[PDB]
Symmetry: C3
Subunit: 276 residues, 3 copies
Amino acid sequence: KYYHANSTEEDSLAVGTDSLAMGAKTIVNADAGIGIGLNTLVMADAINGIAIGSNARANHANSIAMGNGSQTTRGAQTDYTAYNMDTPQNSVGEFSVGSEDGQRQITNVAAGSADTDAVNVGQLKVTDAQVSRNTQSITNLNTQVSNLDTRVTNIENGIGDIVTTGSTKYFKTNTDGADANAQGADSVAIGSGSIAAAENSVALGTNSVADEANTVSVGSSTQQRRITNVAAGVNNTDAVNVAQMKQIEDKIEEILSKIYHIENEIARIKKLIKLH
Amino acid sequence: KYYHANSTEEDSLAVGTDSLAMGAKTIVNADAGIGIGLNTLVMADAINGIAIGSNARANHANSIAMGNGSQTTRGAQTDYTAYNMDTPQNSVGEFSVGSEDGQRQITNVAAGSADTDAVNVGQLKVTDAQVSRNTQSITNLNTQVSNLDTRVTNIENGIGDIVTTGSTKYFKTNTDGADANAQGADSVAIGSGSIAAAENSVALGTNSVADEANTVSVGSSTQQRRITNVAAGVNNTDAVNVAQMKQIEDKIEEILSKIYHIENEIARIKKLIKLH
Amino acid sequence: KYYHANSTEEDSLAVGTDSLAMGAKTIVNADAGIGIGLNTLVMADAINGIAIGSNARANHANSIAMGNGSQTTRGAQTDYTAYNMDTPQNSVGEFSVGSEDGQRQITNVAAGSADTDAVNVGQLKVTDAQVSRNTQSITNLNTQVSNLDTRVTNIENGIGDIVTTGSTKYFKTNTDGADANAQGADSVAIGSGSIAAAENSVALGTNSVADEANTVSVGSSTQQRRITNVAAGVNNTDAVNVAQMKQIEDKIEEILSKIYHIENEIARIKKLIKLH
Ligand SMILES: [Cl-]
């Protein structure tokens, strides 16, 4: 003998056809069932079912109950929803290392190769080590993303009007018309359809045409602009106003009136020379 | 018999109460222990412990040692730190397919449904296939994020001053005062508190008021501006300077002096006509 | 006896040295092999190999076949490529709960601690719950990233020219030369190297110098600018043009010619007084 079993209680019952029943109180019923240990049971229609260890209940068909007081709790499944799997799954049985009120760890596993090999904590730690980089990057991206929201909306607040009015706080305008132009070299222009033309010129105003070299127009041939609030020229190069003109205009007036009386002077002389 | 064991060495010892001891040299001590195979041992307080296969050592209580020279290396645990799990865990035993110096693969596993079913490489490959999309996206985001840092900081370098001075490289200013205005239609304005008013006008300068139609002010009623470095008008519409004024002013001078002597001419005649 | 086996067919063969053979038709050949159940086989060089349950084939060395009609399908491996693992792996055997045409679930597993403990669906669900946050964030980032592409490229389209020409649609220019300047306080300037100098002034034009208080230059000492299309001043402060000048110029002309004949008048009188 090389099969010893130190017990005295009710004997093993290998009942089902071609069973196998070992240890005290071990009833085995499912055909081709196997029960090993103290008080194990392989129930009725648990075809080919195995219960190995104290109080182990092989409940299901083709499935297994391993270790003290483990049950089978599922059995073979058909077209079942496996976690993460995109298409119905199938199972020919179950291998249970536990029960409803007690699970066990599975220890000392080499990593996995085939898709139907078991995975281990070490293999999972590689994913998590990645996820946690994608994680930390997403935060590092969030701030970058946020700071560029506070940076851009400074531009659209700092600028903004320069698009609309086409101006700045010290360079306003109020126009709907066509776009301005600096045709000739070195030129400047201002206002609606402001056609500069000649060299070094300036077409200052809505629809103004400076079409001669070095000039500074304030209008066109038909529409022409006055120049208000101007000072009386001092240097030879300074512009002259009406206050200085009128002064001349009135100076002419004296001249005419002095001359008026001179001619009435000379008529009288001439009258007298014929007379006296 | 349907239980054969081709051996000759020391006999199986099923020592502990209700043990089970099979194969040569197989000592079994833990109560309700089970040892099957060559030279297996279920030690002292390895209650309900199973050692199945060559030199297999069931060391712990309620746990299992499966396969040639596997040991149990943990046993049931209490409030233990499981990987990735957020709350203490519990274990009623261990199922070992190996030992310190040799682990095994677990093969031919259907995917997992319940949270306490084993996971397989295929199920993990679904996560990794995702992670690696989040991964590649994060890179695709990084460049986009970076290129918009080099794009925006061109705007704040290309522009920048237009916020500060309210100007461009050919349109400067130096003012702290209030904002300019183009009140009337078609108008333009320039400088601190530059109040344009009338139609088509221009209020050129810090605090300048062009309040009449089509005009071009360079000041207000009290403060008024000269116009330096101006050319002598040629066309009927061109502005006139002092160089052309003085020339008139001096032309008047001749006129007065010629006239001065004319009147001293006429006095003498008149003197003589009374005389001779 | 506590080892019962209800059968009648061909007897168990424990052939290999120190084998163990249980149940009908169970041939066991590998040395130290163990076969338990109906029609199990532990083949030739399946050293220490275990086949437990109906038609179970222990094919490989040191490996295991568990449950009705499971095979070993790999055996111990050497320097093998494990999924996700960065360095060759090793395995001392295999623990099979299935075969080519039928896998099983492993149920009732406590989570995993060591790197070589089995992982369970619950432990994987923690990773996926994260991944799916990194996922949803990446989408939330994508839109943010995209909307800031449509926001910035409005700025470079809304602005754009203001960098190039240094202007707006109503404030043009055409110059390559040096940058403008508002040296003195309260000042404005316009054009290439436009050197304003005095207070409240304006240096309107490419290379123009307004170097006196409150003035409005349109050039420098050598280069000086005309002012085309100007209106005839009305108020005392309004600029005067040639149309008003010429009118004076011609008014002088009358004055001279009236005076020409006055002097030829007076010569004749004087001639006559000597004569008659
Ligand atoms: Cl991720």
